[PDB]
């Protein structure tokens, strides 16, 4: 029943900013000592940064520091860097005769604010191998852009498509803080071969970019 209440749930900050993440313990932390801070990057296990409230693990940069007084525990990133994109969690341990419990905070998603970057847009026809098997996947790639928000529309012989595509987006890049996005249009082979012009239109703000191909031409 021991709980750690973490705030904010997310934040956007620029390279160089000071970031403060806070955790409030629902009770005395074991011996007002058993609080650690963890950092989880996309696809990886959580990595401990700080233990015993304020001890910095030697494999971690000194830009990270922990503090604690009363029920407030705080993680400070003194000069935020692009590689600090991650979700951060506090963890607390509580002991007793018949009690040995851990509570994680809900996590703080740290996003890196950066300058606008226009996507490089690429369109890929279905392979001949896939077409033989009866299905046609058409892929539009939006590479290394910022911010995340972009409207991607498919046109087939100039007819707007609806309901037949799905998108996937990467997490912010640890080096340049950009996103990449795929939109995949899925058609039956029979439907694909009834049309000529395939186009992916990508809109961000005042710019729309359309990349197209003609079926069978190269």
């Amino acid at each position: 029943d021991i709980q750690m209440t973490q705030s904010p749930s997310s934040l956007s900050a620029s390279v160089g900013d000071r970031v403060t993440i806070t955790c409030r313990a629902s009770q005395s932390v074991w011996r007002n000592k058993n609080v650690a801070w963890y950092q989880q990057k996309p696809g990886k296990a959580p990595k401990r940064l700080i233990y015993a409230i304020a001890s910095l693990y030697s494999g971690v940069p000194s830009r990270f520091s922990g503090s604690g007084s009363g029920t407030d525990f705080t993680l400070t990133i003194s000069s935020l860097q692009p590689e600090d994109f991650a979700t951060y969690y506090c963890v607390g341990h509580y002991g007793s005769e018949n009690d040995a419990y851990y509570a994680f905070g809900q996590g703080t998603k740290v996003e890196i604010k950066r300058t606008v970057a226009a996507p490089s847009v690429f369109i890929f026809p279905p392979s001949d191998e896939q077409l033989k098997s009866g299905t046609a996947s058409v892929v539009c790639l939006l590479n290394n852009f910022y911010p995340r928000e972009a409207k991607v529309s498919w046109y087939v012989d100039n007819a707007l498509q609806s309901g037949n595509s799905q998108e996937s987006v990467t997490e912010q890049d640890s080096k340049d803080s950009t996103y990449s996005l795929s939109s995949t249009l899925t058609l039956s082979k029979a439907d694909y071969e009834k049309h000529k012009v395939y186009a992916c239109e990508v809109t961000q703000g005042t710019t729309s970019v359309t990349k197209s191909f003609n079926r069978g031409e190269c």
């Binding site: 994680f104 996590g107 896939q130 892929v139």
Partner: protein, 217 residues
């Protein structure tokens, strides 16, 4: 020192998971260990803690279905969870959390997918660059990894020699209930005729690996 989770993978609803955490480089009875899980896209959830003294303590939500034990002769700690439901799908980690101690040890985690569907290996198709660039000095190419179950697939390029500029997208669940993803990479447009590009797709759940050379069309 290392911790390695074993077991897991595809499990049927209504059944049990039996996860083992094997220690290498030290003895398993030297420290207490927690089990922690993380549902896809969600936060960390503590399951239970087995002291170095051998006594098990569980998070309230997990007490009714979970048993945590250790086997010194095998150098393992074990999590058993019965009556699985879809909501139990998660990456399961064994960890010495080190909240107040300088020693922390984590496994890589093991994905448990709670599903009644069967395993299905992927189809792998090229996302081919144009021979004649249409995008300046930088071209894009990739591999479409389609119709597999369960997660995960992993994708490397040129057996790990190519990592710069690679984007392997999160899997998407298709209306078929099968996953698909693409892995793409940007490379010099001038290199196409001279450099070979091979995507290495591993779907361990089906013991299937595909190596696909992606050539200009």
């Amino acid at each position: 020192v290392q911790l390695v989770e074993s077991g897991g993978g595809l499990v049927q609803p209504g059944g049990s998971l039996r996860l083992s955490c094997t220690a290498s480089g030290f003895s398993i009875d030297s420290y207490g260990f927690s089990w922690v899980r993380q549902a896809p896209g969600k936060g960390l959830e503590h399951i239970g803690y087995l002291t170095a003294g051998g006594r098990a303590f569980y998070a309230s939500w997990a007490k009714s279905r979970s048993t945590i034990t250790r086997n010194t002769n095998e150098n393992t700690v074990t999590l058993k969870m019965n009556s699985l439901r879809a909501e139990d799908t998660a990456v399961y980690y064994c960890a010495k959390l080190g909240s107040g101690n300088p020693v922390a040890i984590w496994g890589q985690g093991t994905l448990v997918t709670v599903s009644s569907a069967s395993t299905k290996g992927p189809s792998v198709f090229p996302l081919a660059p144009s021979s004649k660039s249409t995008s300046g000095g930088t071209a894009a190419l990739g591999c479409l990894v389609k119709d597999y179950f369960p997660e995960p697939v992993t994708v490397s390029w040129n057996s790990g020699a190519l990592t710069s500029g690679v984007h392997t997208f999160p899997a998407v669940l298709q209306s078929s209930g099968l996953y698909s993803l693409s892995s793409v990479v940007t490379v010099p447009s001038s290199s196409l005729g001279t450099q070979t590009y091979i995507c290495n797709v591993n779907h361990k759940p089906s013991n299937t690996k595909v190596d696909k050379k992606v050539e200009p069309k």
